[PDB]
Design a protein around this ligand. Structure first.
Ligand SMILES: *[C@@H]1O[C@H](CO)[C@@H](O)[C@H](O)[C@H]1NC(C)=O
Ligand SMILES: *[C@@H]1O[C@H](CO)[C@@H](O)[C@H](O)[C@H]1NC(C)=O
Ligand SMILES: *[C@@H]1O[C@H](CO)[C@@H](O)[C@H](O)[C@H]1NC(C)=O
Ligand SMILES: *[C@@H]1O[C@H](CO)[C@@H](O)[C@H](O)[C@H]1NC(C)=O
Ligand SMILES: *[C@H]1O[C@H](CO)[C@@H](O)[C@H](O)[C@@H]1O
Lengths: 54, 351, 148, 351
């Protein structure tokens, strides 16, 4: 994508998470996911979103 | 001094006596832990293995049910996966001791199954959902299938749940043994038997075998009484092993036949509703290994004396107060016995 | 004259292994004063037989510890020269709450080179649930990735 | 000072002000009691009379049943006296508000009556008593007589029980009226209106009629709100009076006919069992006298001002602070309203 406020390269990534992935996951913490973005200067991590079976 | 009987002079003060008492406490606890470690690890291993094996069985049965829904009733997916997953989740939760109602599992399963059958198989083409859920039980659309599954699975799930509870309670009492705190009089007697010889300036003298016997039979009078109940626990577990894999794995055939049964009366049903709205090997090896520890509580003082430094000859030994040529001669236990009685009654009623 | 309706029926209670519970009983109005007798599962209980159980002047059954007197259907019964009257039986069930375990040591990485595994167990045995106690809440196993 | 507004000097201290406040409290309580006394005595008289009359009716009905048993079925005495006394004792206990089951009264009556009928009238010649008690209900030996008596007596006993409870609660609220504690601000306003003129040295000056009106409408804003519920109470009681003497007095005839009915089938019954084993005037006058007090709560401030010394002309009068030529111009009540709402719902439902 390209933003209107500023002409710079924007990236939007979507990842599907199924129920079978969470119910079959036997880790120590709640099924969490993090987002890492790569730049010419370095990298940046996002919030750890924990997908749980309600 | 309040422990070391001063017959001559003495090389130790009151504070050294307290240090010897605490070291006696630690030595007794370590000896009990060493006595109980083999059996504790055996029961922990088996509890873990059986838990994982039952979870594997439940997962495989859920997979089999989902696969036969995919193959025979594609029109019921993906809703079929939701209620199958909820059903087997509640199954596992019941197996692991949670408060789950088996009859409620089966009833919610059929309550969720009927509306999708009606909307996708019988009358193709959200708010009317509850009317269908009520009509499921009011018109007995599934016949005797729900009660058949109810009894079939309740009978196996209760014995499996109580098997796991029995394993866990055995772990509990065996863990309590090595944390059994004793009387003050026994603390002083153990201090005399193990250390008070050092206060009289002796370096390598060991207590007499008979003195160790009288001391141990002195403070283990309560603990030895557990032996009857522990033996009954072992034998009742043996009674129980002499069942849940076959049932959960035939569940798919039973449900398929129930769906056929409901489809059989579709003519009247649609009009009425439109108007109205290696495991057995493991438990055998476990029982055969558990019967080797049936003497655990009766052989316990013998273990403490045979693994403590003692003069078995009863010659040139320490008698608690002097070096002789020849020797002259509970609330937590109540809780252990209470829980053993409870689990034994529960076992015996099951088989 | 002895009345049929009990003045106050004993209430069923849920009590932990160490908890204490008092079962209240008010016999029906009658002359002479009704003689209250406690029956555990349709069988009388002896106050002198056990320190844990005792009978009070105001017809109350006090249990200090749920160990020396476990669960049952306690029923209060009033006896008089006229007749006898049975109260509604109280279902007293003693429950044990689930208690996990102290963590174990981390296991060695099964794989010598690359991604390995380390396990830590936390059992539900201190105390183990009894007579339908609530099971332990949360996970029983802990697994971490290791690089050797 | 905290009550008497000092415009000039003053002839009274703070303690005299407290004395005047307490005398104001006593005067208000006396005026309310004088307003409520006629109605209180009316309801107390009627409550006492109805209670004694119902007890007389129950005793006389028990007497008549016992006498008809003595005369017609001497073989059933003296056991007949025991179960008749127990039945009518439970009757009175139900009338007086105790938790008694009417159906259970009738069922225990026939349960006790049948075995003595069988042993003394049908099969002449203690352990088999319970088999007869079971056979009474299992074979329906008394036909529809028990249900007939059950409805006949339940219908009258419930209306009588609720009539007595309604009379007693009316007594309760009327006793509460003259004991209604008021706000502190109203205490000070009443002290100013009745006594603070004496602190300014006036001997015979009376408060203005309009000042009495504003003060009374000031502190009776809550009490006047009771009027709606009191009117509904009166009208619901009128709805209820438009019953128990006839039923309890015909009970003996009904029981005799039931005994005849059971004796009618004795042939088959004995073999099968041997093998198997001025009131209406008073309530009318009460309601006609009670309707004269329907304005009780709305006319109450008018009563307080018309029976307190006031200058009706509003000329040369006391306005609470000075002598003028012309005048310028919950919790316990909540409990009263709660109980009135409860008894009104209970009244209306028996209608
Ligand atoms: C106690 O009472 C219940 C029903 O009141 C019953 O299911 C149970 O089997 C009874 N028996 C006992 C505690 O002996
Ligand atoms: C043994 O008892 C100790 C006391 O700290 C406890 O921490 C440990 O969890 C126990 N083992 C169990 C409960 O099986
Ligand atoms: C019932 O009435 C008769 C009338 O002669 C009387 O003699 C008897 O004492 C009365 N019994 C009771 C219990 O009132
Ligand atoms: C109201 O009930 C109370 C209770 O003590 C009593 O003091 C009072 O005399 C009764 N009321 C009337 C106004 O007679
Ligand atoms: C065991 O684990 C923790 C103790 O930190 C608690 O969440 C709870 O008592 C549980 O049963």
């Amino acid at each position: 994508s390209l933003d209107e406020s500023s002409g710079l390269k924007v990236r939007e990534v979507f990842i599907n998470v199924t129920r079978q992935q969470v119910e079959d996951f036997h880790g120590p913490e709640d099924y969490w996911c993090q987002c890492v973005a790569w730049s010419h200067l370095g990298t940046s991590k996002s919030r750890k979103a924990s997908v749980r079976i309600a | 001094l309040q422990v070391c009987l001063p017959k001559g002079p003495t090389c130790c003060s009151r504070k050294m006596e307290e240090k010897y008492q605490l070291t006696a406490r630690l030595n007794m606890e370590q000896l009990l832990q060493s006595a109980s470690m083999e059996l504790k690890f055996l029961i922990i291993q088996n509890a873990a293995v059986f838990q994982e094996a039952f979870e594997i069985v439940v997962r495989h049965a859920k997979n089999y049910t989902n696969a036969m829904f995919k193959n025979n009733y594609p029109s019921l997916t993906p809703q079929a996966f939701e209620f199958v997953g909820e059903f087997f989740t509640d199954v596992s939760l019941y197996i692991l001791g949670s408060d789950i109602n088996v009859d409620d599992m089966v009833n919610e399963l059929f309550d969720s199954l009927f509306p999708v059958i009606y909307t996708q198989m019988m009358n193709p083409g959200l708010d009317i959902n509850e009317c269908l859920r009520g009509a499921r039980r009011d018109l007995k659309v599934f016949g005797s299938f729900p009660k058949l599954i109810m009894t079939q699975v309740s009978k196996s799930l209760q014995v499996t749940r109580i098997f796991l509870q029995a394993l866990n309670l055995g772990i509990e009492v065996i863990n309590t043994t090595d944390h059994l705190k004793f009387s003050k009089d026994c603390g002083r007697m153990l201090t005399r038997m193990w250390y008070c010889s050092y206060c009289q300036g002796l370096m390598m003298v060991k207590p007499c075998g008979g003195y160790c016997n009288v001391v141990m039979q002195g403070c283990m009078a309560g603990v030895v009484e557990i032996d009857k109940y522990w033996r009954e626990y072992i034998l009742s577990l043996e009674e129980l092993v002499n069942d849940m894999e076959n049932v959960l794995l035939g569940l798919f055939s039973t449900i398929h036949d129930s769906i056929q049964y409901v489809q059989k009366n579709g003519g009247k049903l649609t009009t009425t509703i439109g108007k109205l709205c290696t495991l057995s090997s493991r438990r055998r090896e476990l029982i055969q290994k558990l019967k080797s520890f049936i003497n655990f509580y009766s052989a316990l003082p013998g273990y403490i004396c045979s693994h403590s430094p003692v003069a078995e000859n009863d010659t040139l030994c320490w008698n608690g107060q002097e070096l002789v040529e020849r020797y002259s001669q509970e609330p937590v236990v109540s809780q252990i016995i209470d829980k053993l009685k409870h689990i034994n009654q529960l076992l015996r009623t099951m088989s | 004259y002895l009345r049929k309706n009990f003045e106050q029926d004993p209430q069923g209670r849920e009590v932990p292994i160490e908890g204490m519970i008092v079962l209240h009983c008010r016999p029906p109005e009658g002359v002479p004063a009704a003689e209250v007798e406690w029956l555990k599962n349709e069988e009388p209980i002896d106050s002198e037989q056990d320190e844990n159980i005792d009978t009070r002047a105001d017809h109350n059954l006090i249990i200090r510890q749920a160990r020396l007197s476990d669960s049952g259907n306690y029923t209060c019964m009033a006896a008089n020269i006229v007749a006898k009257r049975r109260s509604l039986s109280a279902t007293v069930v003693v429950y044990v709450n689930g208690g996990w375990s102290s963590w174990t040591e981390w296991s060695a990485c099964n794989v010598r080179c690359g991604r390995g595994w380390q396990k830590r167990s936390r059992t539900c045995t201190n105390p183990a649930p009894l007579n339908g106690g609530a099971f332990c809440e949360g996970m029983s196993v802990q697994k971490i990735t290791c690089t050797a």
